[PDB]
Design a binder for this molecule. Structure first.
Ligand SMILES: Nc1ncnc2c1ncn2[C@@H]1O[C@H](COP(=O)(O)OP(=O)(O)NP(=O)(O)O)[C@@H](O)[C@H]1O
Ligand SMILES: Nc1ncnc2c1ncn2[C@@H]1O[C@H](COP(=O)(O)OP(=O)(O)OP(=O)(O)O)[C@@H](O)[C@H]1O
Ligand SMILES: [Mg+2]
Ligand SMILES: [Mg+2]
Lengths: 571, 588
């Protein structure tokens, strides 16, 4: 239960609004006990006085008391909800944005330890689960403790044994029953939080792989695995209902005990007199109405085992230290970039062998480099080292003869343009898919780069306002490839890392793209990775990798003459 | 907010409750029995109170009323315990059936219809939206009968004692439904926009998370926080708009409840003093009559305040059902699910006549396609990007609707049984994905109970087995988020291993050797060329030199097949193929 401290500390930004809801939750309860307690005494006192009591019994004061309590009861509860729900969902909105802010610093390797379907559950579903902590844990518990003390102290003036008997039952239920139901529903709450994220992960994975699962006949047995999670989830959901049912049955029996005891004990004597008269109804009707202050008390702690389980999920995500950290010093983006690598080594997390083994190359400013090798030789791993995705072990990378770890992130991203091997089409519009790089580009500039790269088709119909990605138009494989090139051409960085840019493109489009890149990417440092040996005569150096090490190196003419591994690639 | 539409959703919501009709009637009975025991509870309480207060009867004489009063309390707690569990059991059976229906239509819809929403929008439509219909079935449906039966039963016990007290209850009773419907008339539309904002936030989050690398590369950390801030700000405002209608309705209903309890107390207190004397059947107002009309004063309005509370659960269900109904109404790729199935496992013959392939929206992706592909022959799809080559392979897979004629072995594809049709299909798709957990679970996707020899044979053919030593666990290694553990070229060969592990009647290779070098492509294309001869095959590829023995070469441009024939005929005949082959080996 100690895991809730980082989240109870979020009260402090709304301390007034959340404490006002506590005060209104006591005024509402006090007026609620009073309305039934005053009515119970007023009726009995009026009847005892009888007809002869008129002109001598002050009946106007209770008449204003019930009218005042009725308005206070209804208005206080309404304003408590308005002020407590307003503050709770401002805390949940800040905590959701805070949780999302921890994702990008962990993007390459920290997020790989997690599952993409349960990460979604943590930010949108586990954050909403914490509204129990801010709405119905503190206010019911401290609201029900002040009310009982006020009732017990108030009833103590009339009698002591009666007040402590009613108040004793009311505290023996406030202090013993909630922890009993927290312990009973602790295991179910853990499962209920865990199984919801397991189902949301299996459902999104089943929805995202529906093309591969459907044809290979695997949707049926992945839905059976999916349906089973729901059976277990619905079973844990059912157990929480059986405890809620038992909570109401027990709470109704305790209120029965208070009503029976007050009837049996107040009749004997209230305050030391044999005939209590109206005071008998003053205690019976209080015990009959005082137990609506303990209505939300038991459910407050029962659902706590599920809130604590949720709180651990957000705490785990927000307690992750990103592997790569950036200096805060401001620096200016250079116009020319020359990169130097000296014995760069790198082992992927939870691996024994090395993806990169002692890579050393010197790329001068403005030189165009082509990297070649078999699949799995570390070509993309090398290109992600230059992007500071991971920190190389026992290796040093230099941009302009300065360490790449000494660049501000807002300056590192402005000096490197990347075309990844796998392109992502965001759900946003076509304009916002191109405004990732160069957010200040105008609509005329966006349209021009699309015409150059061969995507003039996207300018038809809705065009720039057209919704792409999921929920909209899905581009083909060769149209995603040219949209990634459009993103990097808009970025306009001195150093460009192309990871198989002409992949899945026909000969006509590849010729047009390679012609565009040669003209566009002049006086720009380029590290062009491809498995395609076309247009390599215009690259100053050709790097051939194998198993994380550079095997051969030289110009296109030199490599052919030497008949190295590049020769078997070409022939 | 269309009343005609919201009446269709309520009709659909009520239809799903028939599966739990028996459980919804038991809770209607148990709720009435609770109303019976409440009346019995206060009648004993009033009689005990009057005897002690007025007649000064000693407590040791009143033992029968105390025993019966305790007996009522024990029975009250039992019925409340039963009704709460009976209500839940009805609620989860309807929710399970609703979710089974939605998941059933996602198997049939296929990727082209699942792609119509972000994957985070589907998740919040299957988990959050379906689970928020529970209180409509568990709580609101049984409450309609209890809001009319118990309150009427309450005042039937008051007419005999004091009619003036009952007219206080009946005087305020009609006001509650009038304000229940007036306040919560826009509650169903606010809930619909609330789930709309949740489905955007859920869907916008998972899209950024899946494309989280491209945000890191371009330095979009500050810009995506601001967009999540806007998406989450709308969700907070939609949530509070929904809640303000629930608090206002509950506040108004409590206002009338509280005043009537005050009026009942004031009327009886004044009546005992003689301040006002009416509504007592020309007999002195007894104390037991006042207590009975005072204990039942909150209980008369309880069922009405619960109806107001659950009336906003109905609005929650109506708003949640707006998006499920839309999904369950939109026609799928084929208007009628096919029952016809082709018997033999022999290679099939593909035929198309004026075949148009259209997107789920309605946009045509491939123009009029006229072609034939005899049994066992292999064809090649070649053309520019965006020409429709992969759209044709998606229509053969059954993922897309087609207007014209596309006959498999003389049987229309729209008529084929989709489940039995995919058993005759293997394929390597463009940008292939690995759904299963491990590398072995992925290669064995078609039949997970394949022998060790047949698994080893697929890994050897697809060149997968050469990079297995690098993997820590071997063929049992996980692949992670979007096959993170593997490189693109290594993930490509695992997808190729799937296609070759089971015999098929039509093989649909879509750029099967992408992200492969010169030598690894040649090793893989030996397996794919050998496999292409065992059945009907149709591959999309950009290599043009390596293909010379393929039975026919289709050249697609703007959705139309503009050339056909062998490599020897097409290469020297001019046309688009020669020009598209001209850029190939241009410098060699
Ligand atoms: N769901 C869709 N809605 C609208 N247009 C689409 C959709 N899917 C694809 N298109 C477009 O339809 C055309 C054909 O797409 P597609 O069939 O994938 O091209 P392709 O044959 O695969 N060429 P390639 O890029 O090499 O894969 C392109 O212009 C696409 O942008
Ligand atoms: N996220 C990862 N975790 C662990 N190992 C990885 C990861 N990504 C790649 N590897 C390993 O690194 C090796 C090569 O990595 P990399 O992806 O750089 O190769 P590549 O040259 O990009 O391959 P291709 O050229 O086919 O895309 C592979 O053997 C692969 O198993
Ligand atoms: Mg790669
Ligand atoms: Mg394609």
């Amino acid at each position: 239960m100690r895991a809730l401290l980082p989240y109870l500390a979020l009260y402090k930004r709304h301390k007034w609004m959340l404490s006002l809801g506590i005060v209104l939750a006591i005024v509402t309860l006090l007026a609620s006990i009073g309305l039934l307690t005053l009515s119970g005494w007023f009726l009995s006192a009026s009847a005892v006085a009888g007809v002869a009591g008129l002109y001598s019994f002050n009946y106007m004061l209770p008449a204003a008391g019930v009218r005042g309590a009725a308005i206070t009861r209804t208005a206080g509860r309404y304003f408590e909800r308005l002020v407590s729900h307003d503050a709770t969902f401002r805390v949940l909105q800040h905590l959701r944005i805070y949780t999302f802010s921890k994702l990008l610093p962990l993007s390459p390797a920290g997020l790989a330890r997690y599952r993409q379907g349960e990460l979604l559950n943590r930010v949108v579903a586990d954050v909403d689960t914490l509204d129990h902590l801010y709405l119905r844990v503190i206010s019911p518990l401290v609201g029900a403790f002040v009310v009982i003390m006020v009732v017990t102290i108030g009833l103590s003036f009339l009698d002591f044994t009666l007040a402590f008997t009613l108040g004793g039952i009311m505290l023996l239920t406030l202090f013993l029953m909630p922890p009993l139901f927290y312990r009973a529903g602790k295991s179910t709450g853990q499962n209920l939080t865990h199984l919801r994220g397991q189902y949301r992960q299996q459902l999104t994975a089943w929805l995202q792989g529906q093309a591969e699962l459907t044809i290979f006949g695997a949707s049926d047995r992945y839905r059976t695995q999916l349906e089973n999670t729901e059976i277990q989830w619905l079973e844990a959901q059912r157990r929480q209902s059986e405890l809620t049912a038992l909570s109401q049955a027990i709470m109704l029996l305790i209120g029965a005990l208070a009503v029976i005891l007050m009837l049996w004990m107040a009749s004997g004597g209230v305050g030391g007199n044999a005939q209590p008269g109206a005071l008998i109804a003053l205690f019976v009707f209080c015990a009959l109405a005082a137990f609506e202050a303990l209505a939300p008390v038991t459910g407050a702690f029962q659902h706590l085992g599920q809130v604590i389980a949720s709180a651990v999920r957000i705490s785990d995500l927000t307690d992750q230290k990103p592997e790569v950290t950036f200096p805060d010093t401001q620096t200016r983006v250079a116009d020319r970039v020359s990169l130097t690598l000296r014995d760069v080594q790198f082992t992927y997390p939870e691996q024994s062998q090395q993806a990169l083994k002692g890579i050393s190359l010197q790329v001068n400013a403005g030189e165009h480099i082509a990297i070649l090798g078999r699949t799995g030789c570390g070509k993309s791993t090398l290109l992600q080292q230059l992007t500071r995705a991971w920190d190389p072990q026992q290796g040093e990378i230099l941009l302009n003869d300065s360490p790449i770890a000494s660049l501000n992130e807002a300056a590192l991203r402005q000096t490197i343009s990347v075309v990844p091997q796998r392109v992502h089409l965001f759900s946003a519009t076509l304009r916002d898919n191109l405004l990732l790089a160069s957010p200040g580009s105008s609509d005329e500039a966006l349209s021009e780069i699309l015409r150059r790269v061969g995507l003039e088709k996207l300018l038809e119909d809705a065009g720039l306002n057209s919704w792409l990605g999921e929920g909209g138009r899905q581009l083909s494989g060769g149209e995603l490839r040219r949209l990634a090139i459009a993103r990097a051409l808009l970025h306009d960085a001195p150093l460009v890392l192309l990871d198989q840019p002409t992949e899945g493109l026909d000969a006509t489009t590849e010729s047009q793209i390679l012609e565009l890149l040669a003209e566009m990417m002049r006086e720009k440092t380029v590290l062009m990775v491809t498995h395609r040996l076309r247009g390599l005569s215009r690259f100053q150096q050709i790097i051939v990798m194998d198993n994380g090490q550079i095997i051969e190196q030289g110009t296109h003419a030199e490599l052919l003459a030497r008949q190295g591994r590049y020769y078997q690639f070409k022939q | 907010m269309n009343k005609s539409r919201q009446k269709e959703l309520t009709r659909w919501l009520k239809q799903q409750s028939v599966i739990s009709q028996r459980w919804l009637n038991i809770s209607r009975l148990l709720g009435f029995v609770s109303g019976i025991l409440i009346i019995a509870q206060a009648w004993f309480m009033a009689r005990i109170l009057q005897h002690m207060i007025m007649e000064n009867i000693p407590r040791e004489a009143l033992l029968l009323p105390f025993t019966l009063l305790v007996l009522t309390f024990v029975l009250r707690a039992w019925v409340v315990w039963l009704r709460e569990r009976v209500g839940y059991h009805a609620g989860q059976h309807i929710r399970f059936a609703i979710r089974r229906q939605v998941l059933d239509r996602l198997q049939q819809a296929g990727p082209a219809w699942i792609q119509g929403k972000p994957a985070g929008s589907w998740a919040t439509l299957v988990l959050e939206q379906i689970d928020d219909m529970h209180d409509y079935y568990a709580r609101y449906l049984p409450q309609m009968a209890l809001a009319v039966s118990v309150p009427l039963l309450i005042v039937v016990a008051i007419f005999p004692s004091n009619w003036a007290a009952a007219l206080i209850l009946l005087g305020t009773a009609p006001l509650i439904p009038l304000f229940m419907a007036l306040v919560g008339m826009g509650a169903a539309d606010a809930n619909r926009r609330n789930f709309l904002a949740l489905a955007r936030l859920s869907g916008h989050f998972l899209d950024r998370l899946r494309g989280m690398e491209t945000l890191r590369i371009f330095g979009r950390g500050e810009a995506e926080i601001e967009s999540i801030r806007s998406a989450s700000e709308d969700f907070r405002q939609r949530t509070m708009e929904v809640l303000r209608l629930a608090f206002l309705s509950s506040g108004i209903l409590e206002f009338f409840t509280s005043l009537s309890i005050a009026l009942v107390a004031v009327y009886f207190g004044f009546s005992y003093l003689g301040e006002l004397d009416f509504g007592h059947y020309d007999t002195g107002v007894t104390l037991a009559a006042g207590f009975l009309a005072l204990i039942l004063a909150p209980e008369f309005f309880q069922p009405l305040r619960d109806l107001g509370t659950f009336y906003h659960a109905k609005a929650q269900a109506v708003g949640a059902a707006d998006s499920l109904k839309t999904f369950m109404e939109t026609p799928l790729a084929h208007p009628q699910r096919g029952e016809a199935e082709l018997a033999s496992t022999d290679p099939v013959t593909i035929e198309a006549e004026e075949l148009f392939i259209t997107s789920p929206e309605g946009k045509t992706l491939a123009g009029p396609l006229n072609f034939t592909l005899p049994a066992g022959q292999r064809a090649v799809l070649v053309g520019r990007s965006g020409s429709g080559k992969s759209s044709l392979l998606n229509a053969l897979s059954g993922f897309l609707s087609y207007q014209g004629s596309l006959r498999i072995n003389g049987i229309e594809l729209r008529d084929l049984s989709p489940e039995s049709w995919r058993k005759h299909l293997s394929w390597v798709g463009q940008n292939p994905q690995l759904p299963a957990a491990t590398l072995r679970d992925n290669v064995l996707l078609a039949r997970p109970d394949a022998s060790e020899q047949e698994l080893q044979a697929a890994l050897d053919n697809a060149w997968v087995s050469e990079f297995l030593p690098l993997l820590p666990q071997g063929v049992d290694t996980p692949v992670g988020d979007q096959a993170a553990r593997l490189s693109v070229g290594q993930a490509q060969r695992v997808a190729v291993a799937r296609a070759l592990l089971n015999p098929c009647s039509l093989l649909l290779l879509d750029e099967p050797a992408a992200s492969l070098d010169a030598h690894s492509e040649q090793r893989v294309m030996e397996a794919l060329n050998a496999a292409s001869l065992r059945q009907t095959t149709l591959m999309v590829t950009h290599q043009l030199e390596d293909l010379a023995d393929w039975d026919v070469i289709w050249v697609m441009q703007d959705g139309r097949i503009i050339e056909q024939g062998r490599y020897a005929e097409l290469s020297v005949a001019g046309g688009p193929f020669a020009t598209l082959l001209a850029h190939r080996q241009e410098e060699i």
